[PDB]
Predict the 3D structure of the following.
Amino acid sequence: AKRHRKVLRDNIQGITKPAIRRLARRGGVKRISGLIYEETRGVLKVFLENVIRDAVTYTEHAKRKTVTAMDVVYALKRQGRTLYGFGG
Amino acid sequence: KVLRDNIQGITKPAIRRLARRGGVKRISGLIYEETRGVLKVFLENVIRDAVTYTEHAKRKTVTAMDVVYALKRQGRTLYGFGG
Amino acid sequence: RAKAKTRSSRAGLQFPVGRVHRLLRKGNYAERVGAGAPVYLAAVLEYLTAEILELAGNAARDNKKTRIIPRHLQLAVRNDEELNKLLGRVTIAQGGVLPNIQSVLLPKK
Amino acid sequence: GKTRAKAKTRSSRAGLQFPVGRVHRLLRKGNYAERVGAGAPVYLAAVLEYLTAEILELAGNAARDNKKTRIIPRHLQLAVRNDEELNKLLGRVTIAQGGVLPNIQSVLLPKKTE
Amino acid sequence: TRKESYAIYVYKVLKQVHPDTGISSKAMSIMNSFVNDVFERIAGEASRLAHYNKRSTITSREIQTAVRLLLPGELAKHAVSEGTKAVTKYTSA
Amino acid sequence: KKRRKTRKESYAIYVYKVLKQVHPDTGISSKAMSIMNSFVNDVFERIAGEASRLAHYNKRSTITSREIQTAVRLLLPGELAKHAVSEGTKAVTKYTSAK
Amino acid sequence: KPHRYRPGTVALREIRRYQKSTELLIRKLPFQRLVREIAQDFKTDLRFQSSAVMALQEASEAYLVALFEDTNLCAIHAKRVTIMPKDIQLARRIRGERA
Amino acid sequence: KKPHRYRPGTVALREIRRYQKSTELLIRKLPFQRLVREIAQDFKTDLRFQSSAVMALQEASEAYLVALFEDTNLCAIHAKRVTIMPKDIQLARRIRGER
Amino acid sequence: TRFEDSPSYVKWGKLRDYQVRGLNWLISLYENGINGILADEMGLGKTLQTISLLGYMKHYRNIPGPHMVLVPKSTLHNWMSEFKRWVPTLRSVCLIGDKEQRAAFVRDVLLPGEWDVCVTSYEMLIKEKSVFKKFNWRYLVIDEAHRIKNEKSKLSEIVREFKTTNRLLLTGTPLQNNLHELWSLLNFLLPDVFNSADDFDSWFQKLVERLHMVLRPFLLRRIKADVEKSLPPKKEVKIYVGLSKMQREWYTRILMKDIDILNSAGKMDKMRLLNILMQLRKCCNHPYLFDGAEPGPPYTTDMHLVTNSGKMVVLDKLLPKLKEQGSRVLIFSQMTRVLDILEDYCMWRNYEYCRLDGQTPHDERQDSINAYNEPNSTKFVFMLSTRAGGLGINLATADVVILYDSDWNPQVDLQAMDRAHRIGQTKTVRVFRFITDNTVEERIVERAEMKLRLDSIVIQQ
DNA sequence: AATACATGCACAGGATGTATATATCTGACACGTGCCTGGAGACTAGGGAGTAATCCCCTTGGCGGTTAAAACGCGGGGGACAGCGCGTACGTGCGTTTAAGCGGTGCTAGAGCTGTCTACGACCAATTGAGCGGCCTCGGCACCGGGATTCTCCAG
DNA sequence: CTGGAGAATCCCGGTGCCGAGGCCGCTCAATTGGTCGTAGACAGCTCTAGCACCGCTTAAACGCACGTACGCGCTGTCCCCCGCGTTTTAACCGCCAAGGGGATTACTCCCTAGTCTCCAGGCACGTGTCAGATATATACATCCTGTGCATGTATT
Ligand SMILES: Nc1ncnc2c1ncn2[C@@H]1O[C@H](COP(=O)(O)OP(=O)(O)O)[C@@H](O)[C@H]1O
């Protein structure tokens, strides 16, 4: 099996394959390949890198240390995806 | 003096030139009328959004700046015409 | 010195207009703000909110609930045409997806 | 008293080439905030100066590669599209008389290419 | 502390439209953020109209044309009708 | 004359000075000058709107150099942003050191 | 005897020729009559400054060229060479101009 | 005797209908939170979070991937196919207007 | 008043006299109609006290049930063994497991009211509140009454809204931090005399006055030095260890905050985010808890694993020193990863361990405690989490307890301290507890000492 | 008078809408500020109507090509058919690890004081930037010639 | 099959050859730089307490792995038909010139309308509290798959 001090599963791979499957059936697709998951993790890392870079820039400008919900609403609004709900 | 059927004045080789700039080798039939519909609805959108600017400014003449602003608020900004 | 009539009570509105005027002045839109301006703007906001909440109330009535949840108004906006076109790049949190399965994926055999 | 000394403009006082005073005036009249800081239009004109310097460097390179001596809109289009970050900065901007980057798809190349 | 919001007015028009219908907490936050976004978009558009026509004020004409711009067809028509009716009510009274 | 046709202020001579700085032997067509002028007006509008929304969000009223710094950190992507921030900070510290 | 070209190479000739060029591929006067024809029912008896018509021709030409580029991408991904109305309908559906 | 295995393409349909008729999250919250903290660690080190911030951009990333899988399924249907593939999301991200 | 001896309803029953005096106290509380707090020291027959109480109740007061007993899940089989061994006449049931055996258990025995006493762990009550709110409970006895430390926990609510007659409490260390623990316990047991915490503060020589104002109506507090007189009191030596070279360089490395290698860049990987004091606790325990402190590993357990933290150095020097001493040793690791590292090390030094991590199932738990407590036992080392192991078990076989790291609360340290000092010991109760310097751990034991001092001034009476 | 494939029920099974209790927690509402909005007035300046100058868009006319329109034929691409095989769906058994509930810190959001130097505003000077005009060099255009890719026989 | 020879148009490139928009030089103006006087946004310094991090506990549902099997993706063939390529025939775009009036647009006066500023008061918010909408549980009828096979026509 495995030996002790079990620290594993690099953090992008923590987004598990049935979660991408559940997102797929939520998106309404009948049948997935076996290669969709890796590039999907790449797409998600790219998108979160852009949005988190904007929110970190916002919170750096306000001289804070805690990313709020308002910072990521401003970051997503500045990208073209206005998120209702959280904050405001 | 209202004009009648100028959309079919956009001739087939003009659409072929517009396509072959885009990089397409073979072009099937009946793509033409769909291209007429696309062009017509797009510039219907920008003509309505320009005419509203002109009628707010109390003019009778559509300037180029109204077209530039109407393309700007559509997220399709056009440079060159004195922005 | 007399009784204070709110301008929303003189415009027939339900949205406030003093707050809208204070927002227009402090929001740095122009150095001057007309007196028909906050009345007209609160009228448009009131019509838009009534327009959403009527459809969201119908959708909450379909799912046999009194309350209105984000799923109801999300289905109401994406089910309507004009409100969808107004809110195309707008992501309602806790909203879910309007149900749509493409017809070549049903078995039908 | 020196009621008008040597009128050293701020573009020469920042070591710049862009109209600091005109940018200050357009920030004041521009309905952007209540007050506009003094260190702001120097920074803004410097950033605009650097961006214009980049676009003109690439347009001059692409125009010299076409042997001409005047930057035309085609050279501006090829300069902005043959660079990644400027393409992402101008991902929506069409320019007039610009043309397209030359790009045939690899599939549409004729068969038995050899 | 003090933080203004459009909660009670949304509840008022909700009770006006449907007299027996509640609403959540998060649906109230969604409607509040929606009203904030729409008001911000219309006010920014009227500001840009006032800059384009060399003006310096915002009267009802600028926001009426901003409503003409921002909304699709029948929604824009009915919002313009509602706004003109409300400003005639305000001026006449 | 003809009422001395109105002062249509634009960015012609600054574009032309910078063009003589980088490629000192290269002219420019007038339509390309209109392109660069519309470009610099658009970019100034973008940075101004961004710094205005920043100063609005922090509940302040003074657009100063820090908000333009974070506005060009938001707008410009990557290497362009870092080079522009370095150049703008150099210009501001030169103008403050020599005012 | 009348020496011909193989079907599929004059199209590549035209692709290189038009991507090299930067002119207006649609002629200007029928486009102007089109714009007046569809502005006839928004406000009657308008006037166009003809820099407006030049700007509209540039905007619609750039829009249609980007549309045909993405449509060509579609009909190549679908294992074809020719483009067909399902490809352009997919292009506007994915891009979001069509709901 | 003879256990009742469902056909390929039936549990898929019931899963699609069940997950489209719901509105809850799909990604599990602690791996997403640790992923967000590792992305945000790259830009700046000492970053706390709101604990509604991560829920906010979880809803954002979920809506993004749902739209991406939707038009990916669209273009895969267009290719006379049912299974989605890497070229599907590459074409969708290209003609969508992204990188 | 009542039974003036070790009574007769208990079978194989040797009640000591002070427990019988406490029984008279509880029955006097029952006569006065007041919910009380039985909160003396551990190892004072407290489970035998309440078992003797219900053995009096069912026999001479004709109360056949129900009287639930709340325990931590590490004490269910212990309580059921004490019920089956001392007062057998009460119908004895116990509930544990997933929803399937829970449904089977309620369908069998919990419908008709057939049992008399039902021991039940905490989370089982949180899952079956809908079942147990459908009963008329006579008593309510909570063993280890410190899950009710705050009065805002969902367990605190769900035990406050029991429609029941009597409540009784059973803990060892009734004070937790200052006053609010006693406040919440008083607002649980007798809620109709208690309104706000300011009332408790205004009632709070004033400290000893409020102490007797608790002690006379409802409190009982003793220690084994008052009643036992047959045992060593304690035997403690506070030994401080050195800091290894790897320990010191890891301490400077975590104090400059700019350390990691596990990518192309030298990032931080979130490990120095907010709570740097517990990161220094993790450092001072062992650097190998962090990533890559061992080299790019073929996972062998060298002596460099034990010579890279001074606690482990003194520990490896002392385990043969206790082997020649020849008695059972008892290690209490707070961090479970440190317990895993000790598992690897005692496998490397080939002693017999029984790991009590806190995620082990109960069926592999009670038999492990029994095999440690067998007559002439063999399992030399006994590795436990401090909380889920040292909360409520009895380990009178050993005599030396190794408190590896004292946590922020000194009273759970006293609980894991006196686990070995349960009934007393044939030998003396040696304590070898470790502490590292030049860190926050001295501040930990100092704040624990101030908490223990403000507990001591009131716990002397 | 038994085989071959097809159509269709039967029924075995599994999910699922629904009937009904009920536990709860969370939205609806009641109250007590107080701070923002309204009443009320002085004002000045931004907009509003007038007015002539004038550029500048719209019609008309001609004509001369250049592009569009129509036609053919065929060759190659789209599309249906079919064969296969392996890649993905589905069911089940272990296992792990998220999730809700604990304690248990303390960093850091956040509110309030408060003093200054920051920008606003105004005056006055003076000069740089827009406009106008002239002029000539870069570039578009045109002949024309020489290379450069393509297609087909045809002798390998 | 098949490279290749050679026509054979296509296209680059060269060399004039006009020509007309950059390009620079006055010009003179609205704008900006210098001075300085106020005032109040923000920098900076408090406290403070809210919530964010962080590990343990304990359940239990999903994730992982594997088995199996079959259904869809991929390739390959045929065919057929329909867009590409070229030729011939129209047609109307574009260039040029000229007129005409009309919107426009910069200047002028004037005048209401939003701003500024006190003074008071009542609607919006924060806090608390409680009952009912719904989340949950369990039970049961109600549909949907699936497929085994009985047979409903065909085959023999
Ligand atoms: N009469 C007695 N005879 C022998 N042993 C006793 C007697 N009474 C109590 N004990 C021992 O003292 C121990 C006290 O344990 P206790 O502290 O009551 O457990 P908890 O900490 O759960 O309350 C019991 O486990 C029991 O073994």
About this structure: The radius of gyration of chain C is 20 Å.
